[PDB]
Symmetry: C4
Subunit: 198 residues, 4 copies
């Protein structure tokens, strides 16, 4: 079975290579940034660990300030500086195996869809993880490479979801104690248009 | 094999959360209401049981009047009030197992594609059901989440059909004695356009 | 493995209900007639048996004159009248089993994609046939139900091909004794534009 | 697992029949030429063998001068003339078997998507190869047939990739010694508009 159920206690958020250099070059970057912050804010509300990564941070900068300020509150965040395109460096793999072996569901955000996101996805699939690509929160230099990467990841087994669909999947019940604050986050997230909804 | 054949003896119609508060907010909701009503009228002709659900009725309202009026005439209908996003709440599942264990094909209509339709679809597939998503009878607040959700369900095994394709599948032969009145239903259904046809 | 190779010795062309009633109801109908006629012409050059059907011919009319004229010179044709939406009526299925059991690759053309083409495709896949849907030569009353049906069939394993692609698969080698006449057919086919190429 | 990892040591580049008569006939031919040249240069940098074919070369012409001149810089190139539409002629297959049996990943470029690229991909899949179609670097006479063939090949197990995505996963790591010249190659490639990005 390939169902891609999402449980808060079995899930972890991945944010890939959202640097300041790629500002002004990524297709629909404001949507990518706004959507990723909604995921991060959701990660706090359902106690999801967050793994954040930077690619050649020396000559490409750090994570953009919009998400960096959001990440301060989150209880469990570890930031990895890498130069492998895939996020699954031995340090990240050890983090997942040593501190959260029961979490086999990865919610994947970041850029570029067809470079770091894709390679992270395939390595995660190789290691037996369920990969959930948040299509709202991934993009590339061109729209062509974003749409291609989504389908290329899909044909390898990755579930392609959205910010709202993933979050309501993790909520699973409006009668849960967290639903009221989940709804506020969703309502606030809807106040900005989706740049990919063409 | 993954054929998605539809037999009236082993089929059942699900109507998810088509409620008043979504009037004027959901993408092409009138097409959703009209297509769902055709499916409900079709279930009367082919004697399909109907399961209807409402999500937090005291805030989102009851089922829209057009569908609730059409549900008056159906022989086998039960309406459930629920807080879980998925329709497979224990009261609904108790109905399926204790009343119709032989019906393992679910025709799914309603809103939203990416929240309650999706989670119903995943849970139904978990229990060995065949899920046929009536694509022109499901929708979301944005077209983006609708299209994403349809492919997200198809990637898990759900069959993506339409009102005409699914109804003609159930009929299976124009020589059957029910085809004369099924034809009348299709002809009336075609008097209005498809809001998703662009 | 699902390669969908096409060999003339094991292939047969199916033409589904291209009748006069639809000359006024079907999206991109002229392309459907033209592409189907190219398939019939190719069936003659490659010695492919052809199975044609009519749905309720007493009321819906016979095959369109453009195709019926082209069928006169075809060596192996058998035309069946049916009320069942699927083309795989017992009389048809007897013809395949008794007279050409070695041919398990079916080239599928006709209308409508979502009713009679799809139900034929599902029944053929049930009996172990490889189904090649000629997307160039199938359509519905609406573009929505054609595109839906194409993916709905592919999701079950049907190979979605085109008039040029299927023909050139069968004409494996340009050094074959058939290539010169096959080229004359393709150049004639390309003289009138593919209406689906939008 | 259908991951489709790409390793330079086990990968080979195929260029299908980019000849001199298809100028003015192939949809977005300039993009196909530029994308293939980027692949050819990447093969040189990553020490990937290159196999080029021409179909009926005497009457269809040689490989286009843009790609022909670039092949002058690559040491490991083999150019063959063929009558068979598929690239897997015995001469080409013997070159693979007796000179690089360890390379079972193929990056596929050229024209036409639905005739020569497709049949090459099907034959390669039949022989246990991973086929990666560089969607950036394939096209047909019509947009319709290229789009069809891409999904017709993905449906059979081929990975649908792009020039940038395939190259970056071949490089695997930004700390590799060849990354600097690869980044220059990618930088030049990003400056050319994508004819299929619309």
């Amino acid at each position: 079975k390939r169902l891609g159920h999402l449980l808060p206690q079995s899930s972890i958020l991945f944010v890939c290579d959202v640097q300041e250099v790629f500002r002004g070059l990524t297709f629909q970057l404001p949507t990518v940034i706004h959507s990723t912050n909604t995921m991060v804010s959701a990660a706090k509300l359902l106690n999801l660990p967050v793994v954040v990564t930077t690619q050649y941070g020396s000559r490409l900068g750090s994570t953009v300030s919009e998400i960096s300020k959001n990440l301060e509150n989150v209880n469990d965040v570890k930031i990895f500086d890498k130069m492998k395109f895939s996020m699954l460096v031995p340090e990240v793999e050890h983090h997942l195996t040593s501190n959260m072996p029961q979490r086999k569901s990865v919610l994947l955000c970041g850029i570029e869809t067809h470079v770091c996101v894709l390679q992270t996805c395939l390595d995660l699939l190789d290691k037996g993880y369920d990969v959930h690509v948040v299509s709202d929160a991934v993009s590339s230099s061109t729209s062509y490479n974003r749409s291609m990467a989504l389908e290329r990841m899909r044909q390898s087994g990755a579930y392609i979801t959205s910010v709202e669909s993933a979050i309501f999947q993790l909520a699973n019940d409006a009668s849960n104690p967290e639903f009221k604050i989940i709804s506020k986050l969703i309502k606030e997230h809807l106040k900005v248009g989706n740049g990919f909804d063409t």
